[PDB]
Write a protein that binds this ligand. Structure first.
Ligand SMILES: [Cl-]
Ligand SMILES: [Cl-]
Ligand SMILES: [K+]
Ligand SMILES: [K+]
Ligand SMILES: [K+]
Ligand SMILES: [K+]
Ligand SMILES: [K+]
Lengths: 186, 165, 186, 186, 186, 186, 165, 186, 186, 186
């Protein structure tokens, strides 16, 4: 999989808080990033997953995490969706348009026979390495709280090399210190 | 990704409740399955995660879900690990050995420079279709409760396609 | 060159008069067809050209001509655009979504570096043969009346094989009949 | 697709106002150029279209636009035709001969089974970029008035970048100024 | 060289005595044929040669020989030239138009850099076998009396097999009988 | 065809007036040359043709024209034939032997199934450019008077550039001056 | 075969006398080496053979010979096996883990359909040259005394090239 | 390695007890075989390894094991060596000559830059599967008694499937019975 | 290498005792054949060798051996040579002409830079198998007596399979009978 | 064909007069060399030919000619053969072993299906050029006296470049001098 690989260069237009901006990989350097892919704008389902990320966005920015939602629609479409839907209107992070499919293909996330991205979330660290990946079928919700947890854990191992976060790890809980004597002990 | 693709045929030995059994894709037919990959027996993060899945195993079995843990170690090694660790001894689901690495590569989950599988979880429906995928870096834990929630969502949308807004 | 070539098979979803439908090359067999490509929904030059075609749609249907607008946006986006623009709301012809870009490539009409189609119009006869092509750069509008004139002329020539319609030909004006005697005499 | 691509180099003999001249792409640089392809000298639809362009050549020159008609006949034949037809006699622009077919193939406009060019018109700006294309079937005549309209719109857009001419736009009519604000409003 | 090879199939339009016709390889079956290539209509050297052939056309028809002049101009152009020039107006043989160059290339007679044929003459027998070739350079005119001489000699060789026409063979002169005894005796 | 191409380099042994010599492309530089190919020594038709050329050899030498007869036999064989035949004994020009076939193939004149050259004559100018070609079939003899006619005409064209020899041009007859005014006047 | 070829570069983790160490070809330079491959930890034939080499290890060390056992299991597994079996606990030479299988394939010794090494022994001289090779089927035992004899013969011919008839 | 693979077909001449015979793989079917390779006949070293096998040959035949020694010399050379050396004279098994190198290459045992086989011994069971392999450098003796041991062990596991022979196994000694309960126990 | 390979099919014209004949491989079947290649007719070393074979042709015919001399000259040249040289005049065997070089290349005997065959002699048995080859440099003569010796030995060996003729073997001398017993004894 | 080609580089071990040596192409530079190939040591026809060459070895060394016998056997085998055959014991020239077959393939002399060389002899001059080749089938012996004759002739021609040695030429007999006058006169 693309776990533990570096993200590839990209250049896309985006809608962000009433403005059109350009995003490239250079904007991700030195930062934590979340690439949040979804198939299409303006479908008949409430865009809850994106709204749930927007609800957590202040906290994600406090942790220095930037969020980019991505679909193969244009930034023009994103802007109209943002005006037409109260849920989407809550989004203050960048909505990237990827009509060439190139960003989606960099993350190996294209449904080629449909021309739409799959429902994938990628966590990328400040050096561009992918640290977590989540892909679900339609109807299987992506929980923004499990995403926050994973990010906090990724930030923790980065700040404490020599330690690993066991299952269900949360802040305050015990970590493990990989060693010879710990081999076969747990 | 492999989302929404059918799992590939496989044939592997496993340790399960004190015996060595053979597992193939025919054992997954008509059942919900969780393929739980981890890098290596006799290490550290791997057992807490495996133990957390063992703690929910009764519940997963009430939902018609089978669990298969997979690493590139042999079934011999799993048996030995099951006898020596208190956390692993709780496991009652099948521990598959994948020394040729074929099952891992079928799930595109190999660390090729280490010969070990990445920390990946796959939810596979009764038709062999992969419905959820999770992969994390060495040190970021999986949450068995989030896995359960997803499995319940997957079962619900299968039973009731189209219930949305 | 796609002039005097046969259209290739396609299968696309479309928005037409409040519903979603499938459109394929078989729906064009036996009919006159206009494939009207444009780059993106929710932009500026695109709606005026599409509305202008919607104004001639009653006349075109009386001539047996079906209209298909095409962009690489999805059919969901078309529907949304249709509900929010007064200009697009008057479209009663099929709005095809081509997110894989396969129909656009069939017509060799993709801006590959943008993932959007160019501003191209094609006139296709009942046998699937393209009889007229028009392509313009981003800021130059098309004129549906010139489009109509070309369709009428195309119909005449199909209906009168040993005749040809000269420059600026309108219904009822003097046509020419290619022969040995007429050679070099105009 | 040739829209928005640069014309290729060429070198051809042409008949222009009683003399044979050489035309190359260097003659087109810094000028607006119309390449008017037609299938054959001493035929029927071909002269009426060429005469119609001649009727507008005074205005086109006034706007800095050069015209080049092109067929696979030789420049010798164009001269004989100029002398024998009262319509061709009024042509004051260069009548290019393309017997190798090289210029016709640069514009991808050969009828390979006939060795004759198709009825295509290309509008080229001072930088060599193709801004408008029109191709019609053998029996359908082109309309010089619509060619004029397009040239004027292409010239306007060159001069007012950030503006675009909507459908049916003519000199002295309202133009659109793309902005974030205007998206989805028309 | 193409001496003693079979002509390849062809299908070309032509002008012959005020009418347009189709010529193919079937029209030459069972007949003797002269393919007279020249570079271009409405030029200078070409008509004098074509006229010289026209003068000898009755004699040729008596010998069962058909003439086919060829250039890469169209049959429309040949008609106009036929009406235009007093030299060309006396041609009663078929003027083939070869705008695709296929017929010229079958006889490996194309000037690929000009798209015009060279000045070549081919004698073809009733079985389609080329028995004589003549190619001269741009500006050197051919002479039909030579052509007739070669034709008469070709026909004798066919009607009297086992004999050969020596240099300067004219009707009534001695012919050689190839044999073992004659080897090195001349 | 090879008309108006430059001869390729060659190196062959030859027999000339009781002596063996080497001939290369350098020996033809600055001179007019006639390459007279024939199929085989000690045959029947070949000597009569070679003799006919021998008769005209003084006239040719006055015009600065050198003769080179060629066959795929060796120079040893040419000598023996020179001693053996009264027709051949009168040849004072160089008899080239081309047993490798390289020289024959440079002139695309090989009968690949026999390993013998066809009956072809090539006129080459001082710059090595072929100005006239003649190929006849096994058994049709060539005529040197024709050859001289083509040679004299080739030389005039070279010494008076901007003029062209019409059909049947002989010394003293009118020549054409290619121009614009003359197009379609003949 | 690989007889008389130079061993290829490698980098692997090993268990040795209670610690994890890294082993590369630089540790073999200037020494006589025995590479002892076996299919899998926590099995049957493998330990008797490994124990027999452990019984001669003091002697092999008196002759300047280093021993490396190799299997496709991890160094973690070797450590666990060393703690649980009385036969393996006697091993004081390095137990190399080869999970990517690179060291095994360098010696052309992989059972590709099992992901396990074949039962092969290689004797490698101080210049990296392979001087003796032995490979046996599953179930045919290696003889550590025959190995010793060969190592002594290899050392003798190296010291005294040409002493024959 | 070739361990546990089937031997490939072969056809070689051999010297055996004063006679020349032919050996193919068909002679190995249903039998145990030992292929004993060695570099060359008639060198300056006493051929002890081959003599040591000859000393054990009666016993090997009682166990139904056939022996074939192989080098790239001819069977002619083997026969002369057998007459000249007392050690070689003891050999009653087949001495195969392999001058094409094909048998040696089937067992991947060629030193290609020398054209001699390496010092390899292969034990092959009645189904053609290689069960043991031994390769040594020069001076490192192959012990025929270790070979007998291996063979007895190979024959034993074949006769008692479900059992394996541990290290140093000899007849009378205990075997192991691969089972789950034995896992990690030894 | 051609020793012990079968001759390839061929079809050539030849001069034999005042007539031209066709020779093919079918003429060689069931006969012993000598293919005597030489570089050129009317040269120096070539006739002395050919005459020497002629001196032995009576004996060769008596032994059922046919002879074929071969060069790249034509059969016409062989006849002229037969008439002019008292040495060649005594040749009663077929003098094959190989102007395509095809027969010479079948025997791999072309001097590719000269288009002449090298001085090679091949002995072919009734089954088409080449049993003896001799090739010499340009200046070295072959000896027909040694050719005879070889033919007689090849015929003896055909007749006494299991026997061989040793060095210097001549009719009625001791021959060897290969056996195991004779190995290493001579 | 290896006639008149240069020998290729080689490096082989040999047995010569009681010792083992290396032989390469450099040992032949500046000397006359005979490469005498034979199939196998310890056989029947081979020794009589080799002994026969050993009988002329004193004469050959007086002529500056070195002899090399070659087989695919090893040099060890040669030595052994040398010690056991009365015939081989008289060989004082180098006996090359070619177990890789590389020298035999250089001379294109391998029986690939046997791994043995054919019965071929090559005469090589001081410049490494092969001047004579002889190959015979398995039972036909070579004659060293014919070999000597060819070497002498080869030496003469090298020593007298404008001369050639005819058929059956022996030292002192009449040689020929190729020239124009001698053509066709023998
Ligand atoms: Cl385009
Ligand atoms: Cl050969
Ligand atoms: K799209
Ligand atoms: K043309
Ligand atoms: K493993
Ligand atoms: K030839
Ligand atoms: K050999």
């Amino acid at each position: 999989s693309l776990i533990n690989t570096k993200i590839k260069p990209f250049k896309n237009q985006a809608f962000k808080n009433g403005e059109f901006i350009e995003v490239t990989e250079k904007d991700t350097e030195g930062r934590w990033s979340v690439f949040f892919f979804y198939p299409a704008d303006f479908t008949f389902v409430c865009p809850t997953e994106l709204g749930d990320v927007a609800d957590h966005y202040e906290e994600l920015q406090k942790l220095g995490v930037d969020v980019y939602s991505v679909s193969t629609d244009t930034h023009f479409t994103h802007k109209a969706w943002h005006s037409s839907s109260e849920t989407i209107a809550k989004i203050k992070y960048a909505m990237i348009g990827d009509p060439t499919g190139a960003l989606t293909r960099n993350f190996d996330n294209m449904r080629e026979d449909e021309g739409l991205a799959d429902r994938a979330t990628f966590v990328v660290d400040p050096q561009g390495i992918i640290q977590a990946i989540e892909v679900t079928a339609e109807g299987i919700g992506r929980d923004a709280s499990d995403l926050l947890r994973k990010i906090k854990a990724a930030q923790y191992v980065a700040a404490h090399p020599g330690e690993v976060a066991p299952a269900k790890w949360k802040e305050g809980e015990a970590t493990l210190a990989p060693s010879l004597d710990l081999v076969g002990k747990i």
